[PDB]
Enzyme design. Sequence first.
Site, mmCIF file in Angstrom:
data_model
loop_
_atom_site.group_PDB
_atom_site.id
_atom_site.type_symbol
_atom_site.label_atom_id
_atom_site.label_comp_id
_atom_site.label_asym_id
_atom_site.label_seq_id
_atom_site.Cartn_x
_atom_site.Cartn_y
_atom_site.Cartn_z
ATOM 1 N N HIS A 106 54.775 7.005 -6.320
ATOM 2 C CA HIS A 106 53.589 8.251 -7.155
ATOM 3 C C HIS A 106 52.316 8.572 -5.542
ATOM 4 O O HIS A 106 52.206 9.439 -5.135
ATOM 5 C CB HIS A 106 51.651 7.268 -6.950
ATOM 6 C CG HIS A 106 52.248 7.302 -8.692
ATOM 7 N ND1 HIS A 106 52.569 7.716 -9.689
ATOM 8 C CD2 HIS A 106 51.841 5.610 -9.824
ATOM 9 C CE1 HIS A 106 52.796 7.125 -10.804
ATOM 10 N NE2 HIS A 106 52.118 6.055 -11.038
ATOM 11 N N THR A 153 54.360 2.728 -7.846
ATOM 12 C CA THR A 153 52.542 3.313 -7.471
ATOM 13 C C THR A 153 53.392 4.315 -5.427
ATOM 14 O O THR A 153 53.040 4.955 -5.001
ATOM 15 C CB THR A 153 52.224 2.016 -6.161
ATOM 16 O OG1 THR A 153 51.878 0.947 -7.452
ATOM 17 C CG2 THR A 153 51.250 2.102 -5.082
#
Lengths: 333, 333, 333, 333
Positions: free
Chosen positions: C45, C42
């Site tokens: 990203h 995460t």
Amino acid sequence: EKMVAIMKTKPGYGAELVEVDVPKPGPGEVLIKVLATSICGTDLHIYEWNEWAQSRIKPPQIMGHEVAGEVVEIGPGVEGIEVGDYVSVETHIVCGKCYTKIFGVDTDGVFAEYAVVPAQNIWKNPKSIPPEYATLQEPLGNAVDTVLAGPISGKSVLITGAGPLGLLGIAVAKASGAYPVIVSEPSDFRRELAKKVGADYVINPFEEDVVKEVMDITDGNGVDVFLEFSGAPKALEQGLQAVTPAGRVSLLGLYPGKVTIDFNNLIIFKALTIYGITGRHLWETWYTVSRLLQSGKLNLDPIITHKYKGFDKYEEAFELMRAGKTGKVVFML
Amino acid sequence: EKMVAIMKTKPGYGAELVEVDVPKPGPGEVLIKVLATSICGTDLHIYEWNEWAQSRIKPPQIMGHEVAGEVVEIGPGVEGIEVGDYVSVETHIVCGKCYTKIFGVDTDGVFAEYAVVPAQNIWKNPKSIPPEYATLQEPLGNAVDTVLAGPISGKSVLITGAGPLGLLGIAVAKASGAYPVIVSEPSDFRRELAKKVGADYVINPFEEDVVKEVMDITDGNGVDVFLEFSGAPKALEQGLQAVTPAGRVSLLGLYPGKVTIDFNNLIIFKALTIYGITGRHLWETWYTVSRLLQSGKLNLDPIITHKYKGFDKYEEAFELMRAGKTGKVVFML
Amino acid sequence: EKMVAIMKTKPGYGAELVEVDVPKPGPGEVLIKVLATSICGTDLHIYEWNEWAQSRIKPPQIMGHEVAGEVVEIGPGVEGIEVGDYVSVETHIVCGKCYTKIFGVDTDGVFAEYAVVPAQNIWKNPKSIPPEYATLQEPLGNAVDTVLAGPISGKSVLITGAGPLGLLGIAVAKASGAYPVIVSEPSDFRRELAKKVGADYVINPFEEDVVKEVMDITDGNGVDVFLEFSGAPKALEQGLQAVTPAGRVSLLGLYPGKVTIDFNNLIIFKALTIYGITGRHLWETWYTVSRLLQSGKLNLDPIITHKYKGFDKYEEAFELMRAGKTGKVVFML
Amino acid sequence: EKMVAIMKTKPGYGAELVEVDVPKPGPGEVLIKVLATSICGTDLHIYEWNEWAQSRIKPPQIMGHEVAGEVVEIGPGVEGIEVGDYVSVETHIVCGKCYTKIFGVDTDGVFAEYAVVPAQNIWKNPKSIPPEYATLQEPLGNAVDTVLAGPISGKSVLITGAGPLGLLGIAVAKASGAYPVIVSEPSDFRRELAKKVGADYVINPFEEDVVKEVMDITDGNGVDVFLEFSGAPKALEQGLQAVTPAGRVSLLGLYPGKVTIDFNNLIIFKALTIYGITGRHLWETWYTVSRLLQSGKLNLDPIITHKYKGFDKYEEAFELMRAGKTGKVVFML
Ligand SMILES: NC(=O)c1ccc[n+]([C@@H]2O[C@H](COP(=O)([O-])OP(=O)(O)OC[C@H]3O[C@@H](n4cnc5c(N)ncnc54)[C@H](O)[C@@H]3O)[C@@H](O)[C@H]2O)c1
Ligand SMILES: NC(=O)c1ccc[n+]([C@@H]2O[C@H](COP(=O)([O-])OP(=O)(O)OC[C@H]3O[C@@H](n4cnc5c(N)ncnc54)[C@H](O)[C@@H]3O)[C@@H](O)[C@H]2O)c1
Ligand SMILES: NC(=O)c1ccc[n+]([C@@H]2O[C@H](COP(=O)([O-])OP(=O)(O)OC[C@H]3O[C@@H](n4cnc5c(N)ncnc54)[C@H](O)[C@@H]3O)[C@@H](O)[C@H]2O)c1
Ligand SMILES: NC(=O)c1ccc[n+]([C@@H]2O[C@H](COP(=O)([O-])OP(=O)(O)OC[C@H]3O[C@@H](n4cnc5c(N)ncnc54)[C@H](O)[C@@H]3O)[C@@H](O)[C@H]2O)c1
Ligand SMILES: [Zn+2]
Ligand SMILES: [Zn+2]
Ligand SMILES: [Zn+2]
Ligand SMILES: [Zn+2]
Ligand SMILES: [Zn+2]
Ligand SMILES: [Zn+2]
Ligand SMILES: [Zn+2]
Ligand SMILES: [Zn+2]
Ligand SMILES: [Zn+2]
Ligand SMILES: [Zn+2]
Ligand SMILES: [Zn+2]
Ligand SMILES: [Zn+2]
Ligand SMILES: [Zn+2]
Ligand SMILES: [Zn+2]
Ligand SMILES: [Zn+2]
Ligand SMILES: [Zn+2]
Ligand SMILES: [Zn+2]
Ligand SMILES: [Zn+2]
Ligand SMILES: [Zn+2]
Ligand SMILES: [Zn+2]
């Protein structure tokens, strides 16, 4: 503004019907107008004032905990609940820190025209459910957790004890597809209620041999499921003998004291699965109860043996209960 | 001694009503007199002689596999089965060595006055169950394994497909305490049958938005359980969208080919539990089916749309099925 | 008082290492001093600033969410947490009203010397667990929920994908008694890490036939359990083919888009049980993770490929991740 | 051809080491050459010739039932088993008609150089498993069914009784990720063996307060799992007190007689799940046992305290067992 209430004024037997101020909801609380409220075994103990009540009840205090009401006022902070909501109450007030107190036992109850309730214990009811049935949701929850602790559709069942909880158990089991449902109850009155609710077979344990009868009904296989709703040591022994090997047992009834049981042959060698049951008090059980009520499949009418208008005849109600002449008693307002 | 039988004489469409010798039971086999026999989708494929049948059926061969009969003769070695026993048959003949053949598919079937059956696939029926219901036990078994793959009492349900299996599913779900049971079926005839069996809500997917309707019925929560009985790719997509997060899905219907599905959002992020269903064919399922039948809670009457006396009108029966104008067709002898 | 922090200053690629005020804990919050913090997919990203991040991240904002820290200050109202407590953080901030926001995604993260954390998401750690392992508890939780979705001791397993989550999965599976554990991973580097963690067999899917190899290892029976940790459509297809009939599947990996799968033969006819997995984020999973960490049975050393002292080399860390040359990267303070 | 065998020649104490004809396998049977055979509690009872043996054993009869052998001859009809196969034996000979006899109890056993075994009770072993471990599979099966009756990875455990079964239980629990595993055993010798197998904590119940110690280890929460391997009434009471509310209990140990237990507070109010355990004796358990053995995670070396070459010192072996100075005794051929 005053209201009528059934209250435990002081230590001792009985209770008093009085008039007190309508309580005001504080932070995190709401005020409900009582539509219907039912009596439970716990209430009877507080009434009779036994050893248990003598150690936990702190009078003066309004009795009762099972209810169906309408919210008339919401306290500060409350969200998700609006005036006019049809609701019932979950009695166990948990802390959420455990690895606490009971509504109507450690706080004022619902045997009054109005009652204060912690917002977190409020359960919203669909308007289609009549008040006299909605007020039985807490007890129904115990019955649901007992009956549905495991699979039950198309399973044979032995229920020992046909008191209000056992009767609710029969209703839940039948609505859940159980068959045959065998009920053992010595009381003629309650044994007949069991039949009316939907028991497929009934047994009078004081006149018949429970295990023999179960074996006859199940062709010597025993029942797939044994649900203990009586709290009688002998019944526990009989059910453990009557349950098929690798069967399931749910224990809700509470015994007088310790029990002596043949673990080797009845539990270990029969490879049973035994679940000790006590109220879930979480929403999941309430969702199941609500849907079963909405389904119309629960045959509850025979269980409600007494419906009183108002609280005036409270003394008569409690007496009928002690005499074991009731299923479920409900006060309608 | 001769007997009438519906037989697949050779490769091609249709079948022939003929008269052949009454078979004699060999070692490990028994002979039953057919009382009632029902038609299944598999039988229709053999009739129509599609790609599937064109590769597994070896004519000549007696059709059918669902039956309710009476044992009239027991072959050598057979134990536990006596002449006069009321029985039904489990179609899957397993080997018991797996980590095999299907009765009525790889062997002569029951669409005849008498039929030979491997003793191990015999299931004894209680005399109280009428032949027309007893013959539906194999299909009921598939429905039971689909519906009862997980908890269902007091759970909301979406059933896609109201063909005979979906109809049996509705009957099992209602008898098991499910509510509300929502059924999506485009066929007007079958959608109405669903309502008669006991569906609480019905949806016509070609005129309405299935997911929207489910959301309306469940107040935006979705259903607790989704049972796929249609085999339609679109229905699978809709049910996965309509099921509540952490809900349960049972897949029985078979699709035309592969399906394209959004696993990320519908299965993974919704943390679903998905069960692929195919017939148990073990006694446990049969025990459940038998008890549910004995309970009288299965509303099967609306499902049996056609009852023929004898096999003479077999051609008409198969045609009505292809036209989708039937629930379950039964031959009574 | 100022502190160093890795922050997403504005929309675009990369991040900035800055110095900002040490935050102060408000009502229901506590302040922790970061001891160790690890990087997750995460975070990458958000760093790369893809479509997903471009729609949810609101800069400026401190990155990171996995942490092991020590409470240095408790805000108003906080109970049960004292200064000096060794803790980790649960990222999902739930509301408890559902039938919400993510720590480090919708709020400032832990890639700083100090961080504010909602008291309710605090998890106390036993002092015996080293910071570099304690910070991997959130990811371990996902791995535990995937591996332990069902029984696993003495079961054969196929794990597809040996990224950090798959590696943690291997560690949990081995500590849980799984055998043999078969891992398919195309990356030479990660496939070797899998072997070091404890995989019993490894498969290079770009040079070998996964299903064939599984069949060889399991003597044609297939694996009892298939855990999808890659998010690759092909891997999902292979695992469904490789899992034994009536086996269990846990899906954690997220796919590029929809997937086309043969439901009929791989899921329905094989009667599989499929669990869609996403983080529990409830204490039960944390209890399991903590005990497994305390047991010393999790072979985590090979998974931590990079340990940085301070945040200064953050750019190098993120780059190594994109190049797929890392297992788990940890920042030590 | 003659062979040596330990046989119960007649009613009374002890047994005789004799030479009899090598048995010949009949229909459905196979002949195995014994490689290793271990002694069990049942064998000791037959040796001592107690009330139980005095009512079921029909001498003369070869003793023993736990074995690891090699098939040397296959009787008529036998399929799937070939000469040269490395095998072990399942002792329970079931009929498959129940809703029977025990190998080595109602038939000649394996304490001989060769033994006849019903083909259906043969279990093929992977050649990698040493004979001394393979012969412990039946007892391991009981331990696996007890330990793995429910989830155990990352769960705290209390095991009462460190006899051979309890020791095997400790080995299975540790290999399955349990932690911490607490073992209560009064015997100094066996309590030390428990520590060597892998117990995280040990308790001497005759010198310490079991419940207090468990509470200290679990910080007042109690254990998630209680496994009863002793058969001592007091231990059952202690475990029920020590298990966390809503925890799981597995009962394998057999008591002297009935037991008196506080069901209300320890089982019902704690909402426990209790499983009565007795040997599965189905292949599923054997598959789990085999994989755990192949995994190398079971620390069995400390459990095998005595390895005898041949049967000559049988008397000494049985005596050491009665004196409680053994874990598991194995005869190597
Ligand atoms: N575990 C829990 O959380 C919980 C919660 C509420 C109530 N309970 C218990 O559930 C049980 C039932 O409560 P209830 O309100 O229906 O009370 P109840 O007084 O109506 O008692 C149940 C019935 O058992 C019958 N009975 C007595 N001996 C019997 C025997 N040998 N065989 C069969 N039936 C016999 C009685 O005649 C009575 O009708 C009680 O023990 C109660 O304390 C348990
Ligand atoms: N997995 C197994 O073991 C197994 C065993 C037997 C039958 N089956 C399958 O179960 C399914 C049902 O079989 P059946 O005998 O009832 O057949 P059926 O032909 O009667 O089909 C079921 C129903 O689905 C309806 N339908 C079509 N498209 C739909 C849509 N979009 N939404 C809702 N309903 C839709 C059809 O109108 C039909 O009434 C089939 O796919 C069959 O092959 C599976
Ligand atoms: N469902 C959830 O709640 C959740 C939460 C977090 C992460 N995830 C997902 O879990 C998955 C793994 O995440 P990760 O952080 O380890 O990422 P990752 O990028 O390290 O990917 C996992 C591994 O899959 C390997 N792989 C690619 N194609 C493969 C194939 N055909 N066969 C086998 N392996 C193949 C890659 O080489 C890589 O090493 C991702 O899809 C991620 O988005 C899901
Ligand atoms: N249910 C079944 O199917 C089954 C099958 C086989 C054996 N068993 C039973 O399992 C149990 C264990 O058998 P085993 O072969 O290991 O026998 P074992 O004789 O070695 O006994 C187990 C241990 O319990 C210890 N013990 C005694 N009192 C204790 C106490 N208060 N607290 C803790 N430990 C105590 C003993 O010292 C001994 O080491 C027995 O009761 C046996 O009969 C049950
Ligand atoms: Zn009550
Ligand atoms: Zn009677
Ligand atoms: Zn009478
Ligand atoms: Zn309560
Ligand atoms: Zn409650
Ligand atoms: Zn059929
Ligand atoms: Zn409509
Ligand atoms: Zn229309
Ligand atoms: Zn079939
Ligand atoms: Zn079947
Ligand atoms: Zn993370
Ligand atoms: Zn290879
Ligand atoms: Zn190569
Ligand atoms: Zn998350
Ligand atoms: Zn989490
Ligand atoms: Zn043994
Ligand atoms: Zn000590
Ligand atoms: Zn000492
Ligand atoms: Zn045994
Ligand atoms: Zn066994």
